[PDB]
Ligand binder design. Sequence first.
Ligand SMILES: [Mg+2]
Ligand SMILES: [Zn+2]
Ligand SMILES: [Zn+2]
Lengths: 49, 89, 50, 1166, 49, 50, 51, 99, 148
Amino acid sequence: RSPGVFFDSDKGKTHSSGKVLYNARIIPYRGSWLDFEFDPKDNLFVRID
Amino acid sequence: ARVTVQDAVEKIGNRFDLVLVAARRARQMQVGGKDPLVPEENDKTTVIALREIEEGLINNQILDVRERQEQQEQEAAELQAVTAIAEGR
Amino acid sequence: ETLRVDPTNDRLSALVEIYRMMRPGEPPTREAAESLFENLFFSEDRYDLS
Amino acid sequence: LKAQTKTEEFDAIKIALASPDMIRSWSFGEVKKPETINYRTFKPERDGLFCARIFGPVKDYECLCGKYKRLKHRGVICEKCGVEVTQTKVRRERMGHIELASPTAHIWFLKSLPSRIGLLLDMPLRDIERVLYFESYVVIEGGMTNLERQQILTEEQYLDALEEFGDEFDAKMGAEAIQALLKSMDLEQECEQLREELNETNSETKRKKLTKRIKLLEAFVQSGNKPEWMILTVLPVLPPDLRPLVPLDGGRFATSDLNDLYRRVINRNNRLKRLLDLAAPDIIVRNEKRMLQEAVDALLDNGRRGRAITGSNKRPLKSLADMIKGKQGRFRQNLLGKRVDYSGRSVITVGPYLRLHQCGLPKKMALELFKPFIYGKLELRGLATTIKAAKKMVEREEAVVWDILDEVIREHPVLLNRAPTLHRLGIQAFEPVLIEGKAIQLHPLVCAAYNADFDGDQMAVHVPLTLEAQLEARALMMSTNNILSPANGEPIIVPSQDVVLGLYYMTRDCVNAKGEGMVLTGPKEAERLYRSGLASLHARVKVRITEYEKDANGELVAKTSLKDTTVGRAILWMIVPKGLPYSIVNQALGKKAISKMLNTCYRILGLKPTVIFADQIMYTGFAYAARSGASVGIDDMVIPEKKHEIISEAEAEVAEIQEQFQSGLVTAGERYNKVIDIWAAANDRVSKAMMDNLQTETVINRDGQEEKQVSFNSIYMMADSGARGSAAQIRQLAGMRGLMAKPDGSIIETPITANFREGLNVLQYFISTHGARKGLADTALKTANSGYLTRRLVDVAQDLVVTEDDCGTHEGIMMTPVIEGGDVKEPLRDRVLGRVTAEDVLKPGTADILVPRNTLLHEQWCDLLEENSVDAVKVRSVVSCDTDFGVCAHCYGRDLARGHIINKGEAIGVIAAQSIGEPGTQLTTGGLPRVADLFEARRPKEPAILAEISGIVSFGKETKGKRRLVITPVDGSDPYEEMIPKWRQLNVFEGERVERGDVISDGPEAPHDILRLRGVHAVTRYIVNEVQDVYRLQGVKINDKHIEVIVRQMLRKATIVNAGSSDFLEGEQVEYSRVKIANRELEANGKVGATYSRDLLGITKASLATESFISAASFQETTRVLTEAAVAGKRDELRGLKENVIVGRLIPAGTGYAYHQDRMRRRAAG
Amino acid sequence: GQNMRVAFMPWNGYNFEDSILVSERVVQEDRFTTIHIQELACVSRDTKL
Amino acid sequence: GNRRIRSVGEMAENQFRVGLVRVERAVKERLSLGDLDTLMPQDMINAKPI
Amino acid sequence: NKLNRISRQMLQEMGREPTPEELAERMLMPEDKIRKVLKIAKEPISMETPI
Amino acid sequence: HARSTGSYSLVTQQPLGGKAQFGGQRFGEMEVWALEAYGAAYTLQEMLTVKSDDVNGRTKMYKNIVDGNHQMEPGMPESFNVLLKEIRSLGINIELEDE
Amino acid sequence: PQSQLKLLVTRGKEQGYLTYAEVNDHLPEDIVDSDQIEDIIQMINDMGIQVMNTADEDAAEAAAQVLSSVESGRTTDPVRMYMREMGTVELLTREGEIDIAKRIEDGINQVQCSVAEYPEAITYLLEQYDRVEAEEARLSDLITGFVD
Ligand SMILES: [Mg+2]
Ligand SMILES: [Zn+2]
Ligand SMILES: [Zn+2]
């Protein structure tokens, strides 16, 4: 996977709500991963690696 | 060779007991205490025993009777020898 | 709403929570939180997209 | 008579907690030093991890220092170094020990989520750990002052409480505290209190946990185990040979990690002893005790904690629990696999000349394999002076030895096996035929059973050494002894491809040929007419034949007549034995007809005739197929002349709908569906063009103008005969191929117009790529899926084996034809075939018994039932069999490699699972996962709810989360009210009555509901019918039997309702229960017998229940099983397949069934 | 490899599944003959003895 | 477009980089207590790491 | 340890490393010992080492 | 490949090719099921006991094979014995009961 | 407003399945351990498994799981409990060292004086030196030397 920013969905299966979901992921060539992801409550989250 | 054991199975119905009994007989012949009841075609003790099952001249009853007889065949020999062991008194 | 779910208040607090998230079980330090957070995505050493 | 002491043939096994003294019993010395070897003279340092004194001599019958080196001195303990001179093998036996300075928790018992110390003490885990690490004090037997017994305190709290009460109050910390806790505990008193407390307060929450704990306690008491032993005093050390220091090349050594671990434990323990003698402050000695705990824990099970790493190597060192567990899933040596002597393998070839009972064995291979036999015979006849001379002879390969080999090979069978072993036919015994070459020659007719192509598949050979193994191989594993699939009675020896094209080309007719219409005396001069080139192989001819029939009682009747047939069929009749009718060879002879021929031959003439018949069929098949000159050319595949036109018209369609979308007359999705439908229709059009054209297009003349028949075109003959190819594939060759679908699923409109005969342009192919790939992926994966299913299935059955002969129950299931939708998706005769009748059935008129009571229904009988109009037969099954702990042969059925009723002792669970799982590769809601879900009892996604009780129903209350449905039984009360969520559309009529197990809504139904509400037979019918729907939809034959045994295993458990013997809610064996109540219906209490409720368990859950812990320790999680069995002092009596396989003795089934029977009777008796 | 004269027809079952039936002319002509080269080593080491 | 291809050179550069960081740690480690003109960029940098 | 000391300069000083008998000349002892000492000193390889 | 009696592994005694003379074929669980489906116990016992894991059984058998006597005196497989020692090395006491 | 661990549990049950990542973050901030998870996946797995097919019993697989949630501080790893236990002891003052050492001197000199006041402790030394000059012992095994 190429280094950069990547926008995914994970629609369907997540929490079986059909509400889908959305996540962005910053993948460096060398370094820690910066992840951003929503939840069913529409609260934005962030996780390192 | 014996291709199909169907007849041997026919005689003694269990088919596992066929293997067991035929094994006992094949042992009686292999390490020789005894000799075949049917002409040996160069067939090994296995097939000879199976043939003997097919001809109905060998089975658990017969073998047990023969062995029980042999117990007394040897018992009649030592009859003087073991009664000579009265030293236990 | 995200801010409403945010347990922290200021910069230092957030840095403490992040440091505690990355390396839990051990006591946080100001210099440690700053060093870590600056060394993660902002360091020319530990980070490159090229 | 004095029982015994020294080694006999032991029964069962016992497992329990070890005492310090019990541990010291095994130990022949204490290992006081971390040292291993001297570093120069590699001899072991005395009393160390490797020691001659404690464990054993480094060389056989030789003392360490070398004082007594003679084989004479044996029981002598040397004066210089205490070492008894004995074989070095006893260095692989004798154990050792270490005396720990401070108590140490046994990590398996501490953390194995039944934390055993914890739930025995009713003390939470975190408290116990907080104590163990000296992070807080815990009271022990606090007496009467201020405090609970199990209560925990802190530094200040303890100091204060101590200042208040000097005595009559007690507290400790660390391992010593937990030990004192356990030791002080009196189980009896706790029991006495728990029973009363159980009896007093009424609450579910209270007495549930209460009764559970008292049960646990009394179990632990009866175990014989004592709590203290959970805390380690003495630590046993494993024998040195099992953790070798053995050298290597270049002077370097290699050793197990257990030496590193044990070394750590020893060092830290010794340092603890020193620190105790040096009177160190508490802060230090505590740290050393914690370090000791860590060391011991890492030594026992390193899985937990932080996973200490071995010296200089990052990889975590493998501990004892990791030695027992092993890896690669759940595999305990006897499971995953074992290297075996007297064996081999290689690439395989055809060898059509072979008889069905033999296989070509390479010379060299047979030489190397039978080497000991060759030695033995060679020096038996006197060709060799001694065994050494025999070795030297066969090593020289002197010309004589070969003939000797020809002697030892003759009646000595060998075993052949392939890689993907599924059904029992995966291994088959043959008779060795010496071959010049390095390849194994395998009989063609067996290629079906092995699933073995000739594209480079390899096979392995084994040698049946012992006499019993040779006879087992010949009377059971022999090729000719198994001619029938264990899954269903249909012949597995059915001719495959070349042969069937041979018999097809032979038995067949064209309109006009040489010798057309003439007459001949018999098959002899028919063949004589053909071989001379005078008469064509296929020509319409009347010939006199003599067919027999055995229709007289036990007697063959002869008859002869003029039959209208072909030259080829007449020639073929020479092969057909005895009582078979000519009608069987007078057809066109396809793969199915050629199979039913063999089948009827077997159910009429017997085994031997069927065998030799099959052989002759193969030989003539290959022969006439060779003579036929059947080939395949590029012009053999005929493209429809009307193809291009169909293409054009459908292509007019797509643009019509396109113009409609452009004018907005149709929507996007509607347009899509329309176009896709018109193309999907075009495909079928072209297909049914090419099919007709490739089928009947041969137009030839007999004495007239014209006439037309089935084509003699090659590829058609292949596809039609059943040799190879099929209408789908031929469709892909001539007509257009499909409408390939992307990875997603959105099938691409524009199909693949071009076919393989035509050139495929870039795109078309690019798309074909995907569709191919996935296909490769599934056939590869579903392999793994099939395998997994087979594994779960054999795990759920296994030990189930025919045990009794006849249970003698009238109970059974009602067998009728399936009658699905239109006519007969499966007949009655098939379903009832080879099965025993539960009770005598009748003609339409009665006082007439055709099939009396219990009689195995074979071909003739089923045909008699077919004569009469009989619509149904009650049949005994394995699920209803009254026999406890097994199945009676009378109930099971017949089917086997032989047409006779099942033998006593044959293991039917294994073959059931195998027969269910083997075809599972061919399976694709639906599909294989549907089968899995079925056998797993899983409740469906959106299920239907059945009526809980009969009687008029009504909709009660209102909307909160559910709208309650209240039932109203006519006579009975109405306590039953089920809350049904109302957002789901209902079915049941609010103004009408509904029987129990009616549809109160639509959708799938949970089998649990079918079992509970409807019945045992209802649910046992539901499973079998559903899974058989899945299989039969894919064209797979599996007898109801196997699935019925799997079902029997599924419903094995039950939950008690009433009382008078056992506990209320206990899940327990229907066998155990029924045994206890049928025993309780008489004697005992007049009848105190308790009610129960049958329970459906998924296969993977039912497999979880096993009496033998050795068995459970295999496929389940090893640690938890060993611990949970150890605390209970569980005694494994063996009795099962798996455990006896592990322990390495005769299987309690098949040939060994007699042994295990006799022994089982000798045991528990005088 | 080497192209050669091939005939499609069942020959007495010897070609049964995918199996190949080859003329003696082929093995005689030494055309399908392959040459292999194996590297075998001998190690003179040092032991305490 | 979201999939990147590497090759021998790139990976070799990465590994060589790792060797350079593990040698860097050692170089700083020695430059801690170092004397003045005696040691030279030899005694610090080793062969074995790279 | 001394033997490890000697190998330091001569590492890049000799262009590859001092010859197996060379560090032995630096030492005050029989110099044949280099083999044996370098031998026995080696720790055993974990028998569970994956291949 | 073919093997009659070759070398053996030290840790657990099992057939292991050390000379390029190959170790025996691996008899797996599915194969055991195959022997279980057939009524053959002795073939299986000799398969996983005497021919493979029994250190005594293999030689005691070999002598009989060359003597012209086909039998087996199986004893206990070394794997299960090793497992006895491994289980018993813990605080777990495992015993073999009765007679 | 609070109690943590219910929620990953109660959700994991309602969904019927939870990814291996789903439990990790949804776990309370209390138990972060790596080998923690190892047995708790088996815990949730016998009652409604997701390891990304079980026992319908549940019940005690919750009460004990809550017992593991209360068991979630002390991370064990004896390096920790030690570093912390020793971290309590106060640093010594330059004079305090002298205090403690003086106390030592007082104690040891007390026991020495107590030895010197025992007649047998004298007589024994006398007889031992009588053994030394008799070549039944050596000077090094009796005295380490006097003051000198
Ligand atoms: Mg293949
Ligand atoms: Zn000695
Ligand atoms: Zn029955």
